[PDB]
Design an enzyme around this catalytic site. Sequence first.
Site, PDB file in Angstrom:
ATOM      1  CG  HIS B 106      -2.138  -0.729   1.157  1.00  0.00           C
ATOM      2  ND1 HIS B 106      -3.155  -0.338   0.312  1.00  0.00           N
ATOM      3  CD2 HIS B 106      -2.573  -1.851   1.778  1.00  0.00           C
ATOM      4  CE1 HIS B 106      -4.160  -1.189   0.417  1.00  0.00           C
ATOM      5  NE2 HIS B 106      -3.833  -2.116   1.300  1.00  0.00           N
ATOM      6  CB  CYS B 149      -2.216   3.420  -3.698  1.00  0.00           C
ATOM      7  SG  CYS B 149      -3.484   2.237  -4.256  1.00  0.00           S
TER       8      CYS B 149
END
Lengths: 161, 162, 158, 158, 98, 96
Positions: B106, B149
């Site tokens: 992430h 991301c």
Amino acid sequence: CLQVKPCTPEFYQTHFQLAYRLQSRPRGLALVLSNVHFTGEKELEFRSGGDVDHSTLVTLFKLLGYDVHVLCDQTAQEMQEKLQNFAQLPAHRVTDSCIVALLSHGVEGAIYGVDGKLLQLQEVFQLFDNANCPSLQNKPKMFFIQACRGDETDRGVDQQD
Amino acid sequence: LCLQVKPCTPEFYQTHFQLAYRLQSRPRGLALVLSNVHFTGEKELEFRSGGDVDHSTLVTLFKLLGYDVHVLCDQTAQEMQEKLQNFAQLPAHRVTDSCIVALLSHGVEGAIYGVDGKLLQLQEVFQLFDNANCPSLQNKPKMFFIQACRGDETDRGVDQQD
Amino acid sequence: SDLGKKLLEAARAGQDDEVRILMANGADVNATDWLGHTPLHLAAKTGHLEIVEVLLKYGADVNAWDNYGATPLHLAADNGHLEIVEVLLKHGADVNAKDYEGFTPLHLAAYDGHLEIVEVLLKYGADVNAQDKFGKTAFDISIDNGNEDLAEILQKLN
Amino acid sequence: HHGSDLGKKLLEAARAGQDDEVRILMANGADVNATDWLGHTPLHLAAKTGHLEIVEVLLKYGADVNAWDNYGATPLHLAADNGHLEIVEVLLKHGADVNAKDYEGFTPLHLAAYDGHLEIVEVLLKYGADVNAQDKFGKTAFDISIDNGNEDLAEILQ
Amino acid sequence: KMRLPTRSDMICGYACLKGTAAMRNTKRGSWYIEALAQVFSERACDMHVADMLVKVNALIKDREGYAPGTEFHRCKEMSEYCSTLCRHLYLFPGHPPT
Amino acid sequence: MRLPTRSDMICGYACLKGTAAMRNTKRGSWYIEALAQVFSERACDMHVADMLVKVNALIKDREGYAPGTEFHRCKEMSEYCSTLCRHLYLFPGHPP
């Protein structure tokens, strides 16, 4: 003296298939905004030789077949303002690509205007995306950010560990 | 799901190594596939579901491309910078001709989250492999694959009309 | 392709044999980069004496300049390659050559504090009384740079 | 599978939806069952993007009207999902599994409902649309009329 | 018609990396521009923008700074370029000529 | 005889600045799929820098398929930055 070698008819006959259609005339619009004199809060030197860069590019983009425009010594606000205009100009509908060179002082992510104020480069690109500039979708858009991106300078490292 | 790496006709090579990065060493270089999926800390971050397929798809791929590939899973920000620097130093690089590193986890603009919940600036990552901190890899192409991301929002898109 | 670029990228990389070969094929021993450097230049600057020697042998111009106005001597001295500095001199290098901004081999050799390189530059009529753009001389550069073993060689036969 | 393939240029001029160009490829015996890295087939691409004319010429070349992609969707799925009534009908007259489910359950009715496509729902029913199908969320073409604030589609299901 | 990402088909070239500065010269200009004008004019005919920038990179990487009596002397610099282009971008200079 | 502090690198990103990637419990992330696809298929005659351009093309055309949600029919765009200085071919194999 700074000629520009043309492309042999075999090349286009063998590459145009897999390559952004870019044979329109003009080949697209080019903008060469370049700040060189800095007023306001005194800090930024005076981009000497910034005139050669400006010329070298204007000519180059011109021999590449681009209806090139120009802007000099502009303020942060003036840039976002005139850049958006350049982005909208109805001509883009008929051209196959777009070029924009921003030369000035700057920092990571943004460039200084003669104004002393900044203009985020991310804001610049946005103006030409698929939303804000539909007249340029699927058409290659080159950018050339001559601006400095820091305050230090690479002394360098030498080969062989 | 079974990757098929097609090989190139020797003719190609003789007509392209002439103007490319020397890259015919065996191994062809080291590959690292660090991928964080199970996140603890302040478990605000979801569960990298399918993060296991990505990890596998890459490990295999880099393996069939001829890379002595390593791996790391569910690591903390600190552990990454720590183990990444080690991967960067590994004396093997001296004999190989390139290097691959895939970071999947992430993240946010400029950095990736560790299972730790803490961040690791991607700029810090690259530094570890530059011409200073990693002389054993100078002039050798170094690929990076950042599966993360760079934000929160989802792209809706915009009608393409003529 | 064209021997020019071929002679050039060889000179600066080291390839010694390569340079001989290319010369044998009639490579233009006066090729230049986008910066103006010539094989000799590249060889002089990087320090490949062996190529600098074979180069000179093929009528290579020893007193050529680049887009900055530097000479193979300039670069040789600037980078501290005594051997080539000498070799380049025996072939008639303009020991008192100036670049587009004035500096001379002596300056470049002084600004870096290169002992023997300065000693050899003098020997060939080095104008120890030359003023670069900063208005200083090979002398002023010995003190400022905190190098005293230097100024101890200039002030002798002005 | 060798160089600028047959049924590949097909998928191309099919998603790019240029009629004349799809007929030709078909005439040359293009594999009317080609797929992309996602599994879509010419009919799929044509169905999803809405090029009825190519959907028609495609079906004519024995194109499988009940094919699925890596997600498990069908040309009807895509056709209804993107609101292309005409093709939804055409695809149906050819025996489309009006009650087909993708790898996760959804059926043309759902996709056609979730988007609130009037006539598209009306036509899906007509062909035996299991108005009592439960997708992954446990809802039905009904629950989707209220939630989405679309009442012209409300109780119009029993 | 069908969808399109909000942004795409772009390509930006940067004269210097993150944190570092650009090398200017009162008579020749900035290295990036020179390299740019050089490689483009010379190879725009058979090389696509994405690969020419790779050339510019190569040039800029080898260049060393020449300005004696300073700390800019013998310095380095490195260009970069990022693209979301989806097909080769050839500038096909002067074709067709008639 | 030296070089810049950093160079000869090439980084590929699954998504642009601010936007998110797309993971799927059964297929994984689009970037990885596209990556594995184009690389295995063209690593033989296409260099890393150009293959990423391919991956871009693929990722650009892909639309999100996950009905009933707001991820359905969404977009995504990959990118890559390079300081490479010569084509980077992976010359897969090369028969013994």
